[PDB]
């Protein structure tokens, strides 16, 4: 119960973190686990509809901001709904550019060690990786 | 890093064709215009009472000095000295206080013949570790540059490290940014203009 | 006959052949549009580098474009322009900086600063009074080297609030930043100071919030669109053209940009 | 650091145990000098050896010479910050 | 049943100065480099 009341301060900007640090996504999974969003959902439907939609609002807009200033700025240009297709485009066309730079082994081990940095799963560095490999041809 | 990050980091290389040329370019119009500045204004125009080259008044000065050679006497730090020594070492630091502006660094003449003070004699030793320095910067950049390596510095960093100690990836990927974009750049002027 | 002046300001191709294809669509002909570097009045400036010529560069939220996540907010950034000169000449921005660690005269250029900052000031308080706001926020990049630029920001931007008799709290960019794009509703008006962090900040917001189009108060005196996405400039053109005196066309430009952010030119 | 360790290993043979190192012994603290590129530790075993033993190997000692040209000529004789000009007050003592 | 934990307490982020190369460049950039690492700390502590 006290987890999902301090989450939804949290949220509601009612409760700042020790330090005043800013509330993105990070900082949520290093305390209230990487699906802090799914018992925040669930919890929030024994709460009136105001709350239940501020949550709701809240969750999304923590979302967006699991991106950087600098790609928002560049890629949200055109909406949020629209942000991730965005991202994910220029993030290939980057991939593309790369392996047309410097081979393809070479680039196969760069997406390698980025997904261990990354927290990638190795399916979705799979996917990727074949992805802009298609692309280019 | 904590988190699954939405995107994967690339060299920020998007504008690979940074030509060395315009960049050394860049830095040449920096630099002149902060000189300018610091300088003030050109010093008024001074017209020459008489015309003779710095060579031919250094040869004429060892024609004067080559003659009172066995009239010269060894004479110590601490006795009087000798009106040809007096000559001698007026001449001399005037001369050499004139290549030290031009370029010319001797640095065993220029310090017999005009390091006095021992402020004197601290500046001399800072100008004598600049020239080098700067010298053996440009044998160096020579090397790298023949073997291709970034012409810019690289810090001795292990980014695999950087993102586990981190808690977001905001300012890691910033610092990827920064650093990736000083050892892609180039940080050396036309010396040619500077000088000029 | 009348003229609208484009001015590209880092924008991709893409962007400025479909602002001009989606111009000549809707104007028809009756405006040309000319391609230029500078202007003063019924200009659009595409791409996120700041144009020559611009001191104030604030934004709002456009209730007609509200997206739907950020439905009811009402803040307006305004960030402090100061004067630009050539790319290969050293910015004021930096400049005020550096020749100070390197012992130069900074006189001028303190001068230049200063009249800069007034200006901003002044419109960030008028649209506090406007708005009804009694405290502005500040935002200062922390960095050690931007020590002389946001200090002197600092002591103008408060002097002058002050003498207008608001208040104004002092903040960071990372914390402004991610407070602006999850709970903007606490802020009200929000001055940024002139450093590309805040920039980006500016163009994460105008992004973040559906796509909408900065207004840019120039030295001559006016206001100019700026966009730097399809949506972006799509809005711009259409305050532009209804600055011009074209409501209808401005509606049309307007409805497309809502429905197809991304080829409003075919869907008008 | 082996030369450390050898070292160590030395002292405690020769005082503590009162047995007498002999060139084998030398050779492989040279060896190990050359190999971590360590040439000021070699010169000072070349005089050991040339003093206690019978010379040294002259594969090594022209290879520690060798060494120290690399970084001769590589700016990296001495640490840079040792070669920093300081003052009275410009020294921060931590 | 005592006190599990506050999630509002956060570890800071334990900055690292980074650490130049010793060669005859960083020397006589010395000064410039030390204010890009000064820069980077700053930017960690305050987070950009």
New interface residues.
Partial sequence: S??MQ??HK????E?????????????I????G?NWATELSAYAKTLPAEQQKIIV??I???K?????????????????????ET??AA?IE??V??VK?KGVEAFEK??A?????????PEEAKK?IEDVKAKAK | ???????????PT?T?TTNREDQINKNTNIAIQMIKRYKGEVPPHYTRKSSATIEQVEKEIDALLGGAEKLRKTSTDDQPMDKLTLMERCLRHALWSYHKEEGRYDFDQIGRWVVYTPEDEVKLAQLKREVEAKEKLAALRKRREEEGLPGGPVPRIN??QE??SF????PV??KRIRYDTLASTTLERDEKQIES | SKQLTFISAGATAAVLQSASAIVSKVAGGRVQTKTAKEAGRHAVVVG?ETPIGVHTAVTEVPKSAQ?P?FSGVSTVVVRAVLPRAAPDSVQLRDALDVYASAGIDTKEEVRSATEAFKKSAEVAVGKAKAKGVKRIVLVVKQASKHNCINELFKKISTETIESAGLTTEVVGT??V???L???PE?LGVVLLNDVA?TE??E??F???V??VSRVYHTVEGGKISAG?????VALAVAQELRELGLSSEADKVEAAASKN??AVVSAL | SKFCAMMDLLEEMQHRNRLKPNEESWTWVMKECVKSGQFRLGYCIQQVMETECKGCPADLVKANEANAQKAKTEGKEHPGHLSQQAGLFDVKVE | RAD?????????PKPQKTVWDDNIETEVLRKYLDGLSQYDMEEAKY??
């Fill in positions: 006290t987890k301090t989450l949290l949220l509601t900007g409760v700042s973190f020790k330090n005043k640090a800013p509330v993105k996504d990070c900082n999974v290093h305390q209230f990487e609002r809240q999304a807009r923590v967006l901001t699991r991106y950087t200033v600098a790609e928002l700025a560049a890629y949200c240009g055109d909406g949020p709904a629209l942000l991730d991202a994910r993030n980057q991939g550019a790369f730079a760069y997406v060690e980025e997904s261990t940095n990354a927290n990638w799963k990727f | 890093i904590s988190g699954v990050s939405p995107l994967l980091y690339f060299p998007t690979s980014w695999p993102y586990s808690i977001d990836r905001e990927v910033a | 996120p997206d996540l990372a914390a930043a991610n407070q794009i999850v709970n606490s962090a980006q900040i163009l994460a105008a992004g973040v559906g796509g730097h996405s399809f949506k972006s952010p991304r | 599990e934990v506050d999630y509002t307490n956060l570890p800071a987070g950009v």
